[PDB]
């Protein structure tokens, strides 16, 4: 019969179908495992690739972020210092306004001959008492020379009493006039040899006073810091 | 000259070499699952082989047996089956007094 | 006959190999997808970090808690101001 078997033609068909089903199923399982492992490897490798770069990103991100909070802190510090600086500057300007207004008042008295005349006379004599020479050179403003030349007798008479051990011969009104923007009032008295000079102007007295009165005022309104 | 007078160059089918008996058509070449085993069966057990070889092991190809050779004492069959069941098949065949001929082709 | 079954099983093996081939194609595609998706995630992450730092810098009355002291300084000053000026004037003009 050219067909060696113990099964019916349908049984051998069932068996063949069974075997090819085995093969097909094996292939399907193999494929399933392939794809599963492929998914797992996908996840692992993606994670690794990302991590390898984030390790470098976070590295410089940390450095940049560290230098930002520092910048904020420095900003806060600079502001905090700026405010204190504004306080100290406020104190200084406060002490400035007083001497400025004082200078203004001196400039006011300077342009008031009714009160300026006895004051001007009082300053000229004091300078003479500190000079103590028979002759003296007086250097004043161009506007004051008229007032001074009208009261020379008064000056010489006043000086000849407070210093009887040192008479006064001649008072010389200099041709060199004081500066308009430097001197508001007063005189500058020099000697014949022009070695000793006595600046008895309002500005000079105010400055010399400010050299010693300013810290006194400062340490009276407030306290030493 | 077709009528050739031959002589006994070998022994019986159970122990003789098979290089001058078999041919490429008898074997299943290039298969991940399938392979071919040769079985020498004593003549008194021919019918016994024919009705039991399909269950000697699992994954034996049904109705795949064919008489390859025959002498005075033996009949040489070939059977196709899955490679992973060759061991079980040969063991079972040896248990039933059959002589599995080892033949590794390529 | 053997071929009527052998050819069947061989055909089955062929279809099987096709299946496995499809699976392997899937594998290659996933292997490349790993790198592509990695690229996208890296870029999106970098953008996110840059956005984080930028938002940290763009968001993160300083002279209000000092004016109360400045007004106090001006008060203390102006209180004894005229007196001080008066003393200063009468010190310069009076030898």
| A219 and A110 together in one domain | yes
Decide which of A43, A67, A96 is a domain's last residue.
Answer: A96
| A132 and A187 together in one domain | yes
Closest residue of chain B to A23, computed from CA coordinates: B33
| A84 and A123 together in one domain | no
CATH number at A121 reads 3.30.2320.30
Q: How far apart are the first and last CA of chain C?
A: 150
Instruction: Copy the structure tokens of residue B5.
Output: 């007078």
CB B57: neighbour CB atoms within 10 A? 21
Residues in Cβ contact with A187 at an 8 Å cutoff, skipping those fewer than 6 apart: A120, A123, A124, A127, A138, A139, A140, A144, A148, A200, A201
SS3 B39: strand
Specify the pairing of strand A170-173 against strand A135-140.
parallel
Decide which of A96, A117, A146 is a domain's last residue.
Answer: A96
DSSP annotation of B25 = G
Residue A21: HSE in the Cβ half-sphere, 13 Å Cα cutoff:
6
What technique determined this structure? X-ray
Contact, A4 vs B50, CB < 8 A? Answer: yes
Cβ–Cβ of B61/C10 closer than 8 Å?
no
| A39 and A52 together in one domain | yes
| A76 and A172 together in one domain | no
Interface test with B, best of A19, A22, A23, A27 (most B CBs within 10 A): A19
Decide which of A47, A75, A96 is a domain's last residue.
Answer: A96
Q: Looking at beta carbons, which residues of chain C come within 8 Å of B61? A: 2, 5-6, 9
| A54 and A76 together in one domain | yes
Contact, A17 vs C9, CB < 8 A? Answer: no
Picking from C1, C23, C31, the nearest residue to A31 by CB comes out as C23
Picking from A3, A12, A23, the nearest residue to B33 by CB comes out as A23
- For C2, the domain range is 1-95
Between CA A132 and CA A135 the distance in angstroms is: 9
Q: Looking at beta carbons, which residues of chain B come within 8 Å of A27? A: none
| A46 and A63 together in one domain | yes
Q: Looking at beta carbons, which residues of chain B come within 8 Å of C5? A: 61-64
User: Whats the size of chain B, residue-wise?
Assistant: 106
- For A139, the domain range is 97-225
Q: How far is C22 from chain A (nearest CA, A)?
A: 8
| A102 and A54 together in one domain | no
Query: Which structural domains are found in chain B, ordered by start?
Result: 1-106 (3.30.70.100)
CATH number at C21 reads 1.20.5.2950
List the one residue out of A191, A102, B82 whose CA is nearest residue C9. B82
Between CA B22 and CA B103 the distance in angstroms is: 10
Cα dihedral value A214, A218, A219, A220, nearest 10? 100
| A34 and A87 together in one domain | yes
Number of separate domains in chain C: 1
Number of separate domains in chain A: 2
Between CA B10 and CA A154 the distance in angstroms is: 174
* Chain centre distance of CA A91: 14
């Amino acid at each position: 019969s050219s067909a060696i078997t113990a099964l019916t033609p349908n049984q051998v068909n069932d068996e063949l179908n069974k075997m090819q089903a085995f093969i097909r199923k094996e292939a399907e399982e193999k494929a399933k495992e392939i794809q599963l492992k492929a998914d797992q490897e996908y996840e692992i490798e993606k994670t690794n690739i990302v991590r390898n770069e984030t390790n470098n990103i976070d590295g410089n991100f940390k450095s940049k972020l560290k230098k930002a909070m520092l910048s904020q802190q420095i900003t806060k510090s600079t502001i905090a210092n700026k405010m204190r600086l504004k306080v100290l500057s406020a104190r200084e300007q406060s002490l400035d306004g007083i001497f400025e207004e004082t200078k203004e008042k001196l400039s006011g008295i300077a342009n008031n001959r009714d009160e300026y005349k006895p004051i001007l006379q009082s300053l000229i004599v004091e300078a003479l008492l500190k000079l103590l020479e028979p002759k003296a050179i007086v250097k004043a403003l161009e506007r004051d020379v008229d007032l001074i030349e009208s009261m020379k007798d008064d000056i010489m008479r006043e000086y000849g009493e407070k210093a009887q051990r040192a008479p006064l011969e001649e008072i010389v009104i200099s041709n060199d006039y004081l500066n308009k923007d430097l001197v508001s009032g007063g005189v500058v008295v020099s000697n014949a040899s022009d070695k000793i000079e006595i600046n008895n102007t309002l500005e000079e007295r105010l400055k010399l006073l400010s050299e010693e009165a300013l810290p006194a005022i400062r340490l009276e309104l407030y306290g030493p810091s | 000259n077709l009528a050739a007078a031959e002589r006994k160059k070998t022994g019986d089918l159970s122990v003789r070499s098979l290089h001058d008996i078999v041919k490429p058509e008898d074997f299943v070449l290039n298969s991940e699952h399938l392979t071919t085993v040769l079985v020498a069966v004593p003549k008194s057990l021919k019918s016994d082989f024919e009705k039991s070889y399909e269950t000697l092991s699992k994954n034996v190809v049904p109705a795949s047996a064919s008489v390859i050779a025959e002498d005075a004492e033996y009949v040489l069959f070939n059977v196709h089956l899955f490679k992973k069941n060759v061991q079980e098949f040969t063991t079972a065949a040896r248990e039933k007094k059959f002589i599995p001929r080892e033949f590794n082709y390529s | 006959s053997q071929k009527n079954g052998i050819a069947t099983l061989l055909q089955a093996e062929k279809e099987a190999h096709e299946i496995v081939s499809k699976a392997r194609k899937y594998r290659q595609d996933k292997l490349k997808q790993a790198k592509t998706d990695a690229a996208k995630e890296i870029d999106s992450y970098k953008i996110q970090k840059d956005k984080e730092l930028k938002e940290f810098e763009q968001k993160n009355k300083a002279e209000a808690g000092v004016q109360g002291e400045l007004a106090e300084i001006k008060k203390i000053a102006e209180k004894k101001k005229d007196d001080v000026v008066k003393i200063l004037i009468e010190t310069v003009i009076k030898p």
